[PDB]
Design an enzyme around this catalytic site. Structure first.
Site, PDB file in Angstrom:
ATOM      1  N   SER B   1       0.868  -1.187   0.000  1.00  0.00           N
ATOM      2  CA  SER B   1       0.000   0.000   0.000  1.00  0.00           C
ATOM      3  C   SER B   1       0.875   1.197   0.000  1.00  0.00           C
ATOM      4  CB  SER B   1      -0.873   0.065   1.255  1.00  0.00           C
ATOM      5  OG  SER B   1      -1.745  -1.042   1.327  1.00  0.00           O
ATOM      6  N   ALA B  69      -0.883  -0.052   5.571  1.00  0.00           N
ATOM      7  CA  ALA B  69      -0.663  -0.927   6.723  1.00  0.00           C
ATOM      8  C   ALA B  69       0.599  -0.502   7.456  1.00  0.00           C
ATOM      9  CB  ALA B  69      -0.568  -2.392   6.288  1.00  0.00           C
ATOM     10  N   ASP B  73       4.996  -3.569  15.798  1.00  0.00           N
ATOM     11  CA  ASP B  73       4.919  -4.828  16.532  1.00  0.00           C
ATOM     12  C   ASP B  73       4.062  -4.728  17.798  1.00  0.00           C
ATOM     13  OD1 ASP B  73       5.252  -7.218  17.952  1.00  0.00           O
ATOM     14  OD2 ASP B  73       7.430  -7.266  17.777  1.00  0.00           O
ATOM     15  N   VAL B  75       2.042  -7.468  18.776  1.00  0.00           N
ATOM     16  CA  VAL B  75       1.631  -8.869  18.993  1.00  0.00           C
ATOM     17  C   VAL B  75       2.862  -9.751  19.387  1.00  0.00           C
ATOM     18  CG1 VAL B  75       0.666 -10.913  17.806  1.00  0.00           C
ATOM     19  CG2 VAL B  75      -0.121  -8.579  17.238  1.00  0.00           C
ATOM     20  N   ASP B  76       2.893 -10.247  20.625  1.00  0.00           N
ATOM     21  CA  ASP B  76       3.998 -11.089  21.101  1.00  0.00           C
ATOM     22  C   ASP B  76       3.451 -12.473  21.419  1.00  0.00           C
ATOM     23  OD1 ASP B  76       5.730  -8.921  21.051  1.00  0.00           O
ATOM     24  OD2 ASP B  76       5.483  -8.492  23.152  1.00  0.00           O
ATOM     25  N   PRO B 205      11.063  -8.693  21.503  1.00  0.00           N
ATOM     26  CA  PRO B 205       9.748  -8.834  20.870  1.00  0.00           C
ATOM     27  C   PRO B 205       9.750  -9.724  19.681  1.00  0.00           C
ATOM     28  CG  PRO B 205      10.734  -6.776  20.238  1.00  0.00           C
ATOM     29  CD  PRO B 205      11.603  -7.326  21.310  1.00  0.00           C
ATOM     30  N   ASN B 241       4.551   1.265   2.785  1.00  0.00           N
ATOM     31  CA  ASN B 241       4.758   0.319   3.887  1.00  0.00           C
ATOM     32  C   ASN B 241       6.181   0.353   4.450  1.00  0.00           C
ATOM     33  OD1 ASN B 241       2.616  -2.178   2.431  1.00  0.00           O
ATOM     34  ND2 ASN B 241       2.052  -0.523   3.818  1.00  0.00           N
ATOM     35  N   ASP B 252       7.924  -8.515  14.208  1.00  0.00           N
ATOM     36  CA  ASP B 252       8.890  -9.592  14.336  1.00  0.00           C
ATOM     37  C   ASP B 252       8.982 -10.506  13.110  1.00  0.00           C
ATOM     38  OD1 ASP B 252       6.258  -9.989  16.189  1.00  0.00           O
ATOM     39  OD2 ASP B 252       6.615 -11.834  15.048  1.00  0.00           O
TER      40      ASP B 252
END
Ligand SMILES: [Ca+2]
Lengths: 197, 553
Positions: B1, B69, B73, B75-76, B205, B241, B252
């Site tokens: 994007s 987008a 990060d 989300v772990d 992470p 992006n 990650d």
């Protein structure tokens, strides 16, 4: 008591909704969507909720298990109940608008029933606020906010150390999957904004 | 994007211009849906994915916006310590806790229904287990519990009338999404939105952390940490992006990197070439970036270096010459099945050779595979999404860069061999493969063009149309699934977009498609656009149908 919604479509068939309250506004939006893209939306719902096997068979079992395994419905239903009422009308309104048009299709299905439903041999569902929430959660959150390869990374790292010893196995990993590279072209000038924390 | 905006400083014949190109793959019916909402505090026109209540691409007459987008990060993975005698009981904060669970029943066409169990701990859903080490990995998301509030900050930013009002919504949007702002006064702004964990010091992470509690996030970082800019010095804002700001940590994901080599330069460079850009100049960069081979700009200078000193009739020099003389802009042959220049095929083969010779030699199987692709891996149907410089190629570039790259090369990708030797060797191989695949007379080499398909299956592999209910476009365009161009002028706002194949995906039981089933295909292919009408007087002349609903309340 009632409310009046006006749906004007332009030369490219684009719907412009006119309403005086939130619930009516989105109800008209949902209605125009059911007119334009019902099968697309019906499959987007089965895609974000993992109920594709229901209509397409065994090939989709893994897909469904996978989709359902990655979200907690309880959380979603609760968040919706927690939203302010005006925001709840956004989802409920859209859901009802979709259903109102499905009602017209059932009135004269020989003309209004999207062919895909006939050929795949299944019917349009009943829409809810939860169904509308999930379209976004499943195609947006789970699409651009749920990526992660940490378990694989663990395996990459393990495999590097095995090959190069613990110290160098670790340095190779930061060489090829660095946390950050100070020379990456950025959207903001470093003067205007440099990241801390 | 991608997206690019110019404010009052660089806008020409306008106060601000915003050109957004969201990339999601290409589908039939279209990925996004056009809409105008008028009344009850709303006044928006644009198009949005899956017809979400939130209109992602549009304007309200005062403020225009868009997005790409974010790839931050948030989300772990937590490696839960499972009881050796109850895999559904895990140790956390001193207590052996029972996992939340739920039974799901799948109706399956032609079979008896199937039920299975889903578990969730204090950190998120259990995503994988390793029984040997008594582990149950669980996914923790900084946006868990904030999905709806994020969707709503998303419909509400559409009503923002100024920068402060817009920031008040951006702060509540928790997914890693980049957001862009442009307004009637010529102000432009950007905010990399999302909620990011305030992690325990030393929590990598990039790898799982123990979920016994010592590694639990301390909280969520404050909005003030989120990279943002209002009216940048540069006079413009572009993103494809790439990283938001210096030192910002990406996800990650092993496959995703923000390194020295980055496709966003194709945009910045083009914009900087103009002093002030009109909306037509802006649209010109869209055609350019859709066709420019991304590796050409990055790699040719190394090719030039390694072959300096070889005579003109040298084979690897025939190749380098073809490339140094190319502008990078691919064009479809007259038969529509080929490229007029063999440059991409060269860069493709060369890169594949190089990668097997570098990362293919230094990264142990089967992970080497994560770095062997050149990024041109097309299909019969074409790429499923945008084209980018690959993970391997970014890493190769980082190395070729030597002292210019700030990243220490702990492992010499080249394994001690002089890089120009490897380059020369792989070029010679490339020349022979080109000769063997496309014939002896280079003038008659006909390299295959990359096509594009509007697929009947959604991005999930789920049919959303009948089999073969799709559309083919000869020329692939590395552009947004849709494009919208919004312009604040002295007169107001002029906007345009394209939603291919069309606004409607309707086909009567009789087999008759809607008139709007595919009236935007050609528009897409030819780089045209249709108007975005906001107000009643200017939409009026174009209204083809009206429907009035009286709903009982
Ligand atoms: Ca992470």
């Amino acid at each position: 008591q009632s409310t009046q919604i006006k749906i004007e479509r332009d030369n490219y068939g684009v719907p412009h909704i006119y309403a005086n309250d939130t619930y009516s506004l989105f109800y008209g939006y949902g209605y125009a969507v059911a007119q334009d893209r019902l099968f697309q939306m019906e499959m987007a719902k089965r895609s974000t909720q993992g109920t594709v096997s229901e209509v397409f068979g065994k090939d989709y079992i893994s897909f469904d298990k996978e989709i359902r395994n990655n979200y907690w419905p309880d959380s979603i239903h609760k968040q919706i109940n927690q939203l302010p009422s005006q925001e709840q009308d956004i989802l409920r309104g859209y859901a009802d608008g979709m259903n109102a048009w499905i009602k017209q299709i059932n009135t004269k299905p020989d003309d209004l029933m999207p062919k895909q439903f006939i050929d795949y041999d299944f019917l349009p569902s009943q829409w809810t606020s939860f169904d509308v929430a999930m379209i976004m959660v499943g195609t947006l959150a789970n699409r651009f906010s749920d990526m992660n390869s940490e378990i694989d990374n663990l395996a990459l790292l393990t495999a590097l150390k095995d090959k190069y010893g613990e110290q160098l196995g670790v340095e190779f990993f930061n060489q090829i999957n660095w946390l950050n590279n100070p020379n990456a072209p950025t959207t903001i000038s470093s003067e205007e904004f440099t990241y801390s924390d | 994007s991608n997206v690019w905006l110019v404010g009052k400083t660089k806008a020409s014949g306008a106060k601000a211009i915003l050109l957004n190109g969201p990339q999601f793959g290409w589908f039939n019916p279209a990925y996004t849906y056009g809409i105008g909402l008028h009344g009850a505090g709303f006044n928006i026109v644009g198009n949005t994915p899956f017809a979400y209540p939130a209109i992602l691409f549009g304007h309200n007459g005062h403020v225009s916006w868009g997005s790409t987008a974010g790839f931050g990060d948030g989300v772990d993975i937590f490696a839960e310590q499972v009881s050796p005698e109850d895999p559904n009981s895990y140790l956390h904060q001193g207590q052996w806790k029972k996992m939340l669970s739920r039974q799901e029943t799948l109706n399956v066409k032609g079979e008896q229904p199937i039920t299975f169990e889903i578990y969730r701990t204090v950190h998120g859903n259990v995503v994988k287990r390793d029984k040997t080490t008594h582990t149950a990995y669980s996914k923790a998301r900084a946006w868990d519990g904030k999905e709806l509030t994020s969707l709503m900050a998303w419909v509400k930013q559409g009503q923002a009338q100024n920068w402060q009002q817009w920031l008040d919504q951006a702060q509540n949007q928790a997914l890693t999404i980049n957001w862009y702002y442009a307004d009637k006064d010529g102000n432009i702004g950007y905010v990399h939105t999302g909620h990011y964990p305030d992690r325990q010091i030393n929590h990598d992470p990039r790898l799982p952390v123990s979920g016994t509690g010592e590694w639990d996030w301390k909280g969520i970082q404050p909005f003030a940490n989120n990279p943002k800019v209002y009216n940048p010095k540069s006079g413009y804002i572009a993103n494809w992006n790439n990283s938001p700001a210096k030192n910002y940590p990406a996800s990650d994901l092993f496959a995703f990197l923000w390194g020295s080599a980055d496709r966003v330069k194709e945009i910045d460079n083009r914009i900087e070439a103009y002093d002030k850009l009109t909306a037509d100049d802006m649209w010109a960069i869209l055609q350019q970036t859709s066709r420019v081979d991304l590796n050409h700009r990055l790699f040719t200078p190394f090719l030039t270096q390694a072959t300096q000193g070889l005579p003109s009739n040298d084979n690897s020099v025939k190749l380098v010459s073809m490339l140094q003389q190319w502008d990078g802009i691919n064009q479809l042959s007259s038969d529509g099945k080929h490229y007029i220049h063999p440059g991409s095929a060269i860069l493709d083969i060369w890169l594949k050779e190089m990668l097997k010779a570098t990362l293919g030699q230094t990264v142990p199987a089967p992970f080497d595979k994560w770095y062997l692709a050149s990024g041109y891996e097309t299909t019969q149907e074409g790429p499923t999404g945008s084209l980018n410089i690959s993970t391997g190629a970014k890493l190769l570039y980082e190395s070729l860069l030597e002292d210019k790259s700030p990243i220490s090369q702990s492992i010499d990708l080249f394994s001690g061999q002089p890089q120009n030797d490897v380059i020369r060797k792989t070029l010679n191989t490339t020349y022979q493969k080109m000769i063997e695949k496309y014939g002896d007379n280079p003038a008659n080499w006909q390299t295959p063009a990359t096509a594009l398909t509007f697929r009947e299956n959604n991005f999930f592999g789920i049919p959303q149309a009948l089999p073969q209910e799709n559309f083919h476009q000869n020329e692939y365009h590395n552009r947004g699934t849709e494009n919208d161009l919004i312009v604040f002028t002295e007169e107001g706002v002029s906007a345009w977009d394209v939603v291919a194949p069309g606004q409607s995906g309707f086909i009567s039981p009789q087999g008759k498609p809607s008139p709007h089933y595919q009236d935007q295909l050609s528009l897409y292919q030819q780089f045209g656009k249709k108007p975005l009408w906001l107000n009643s007087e200017d939409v009026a002349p174009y209204i083809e149908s009206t429907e009035t609903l009286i709903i009982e309340r």
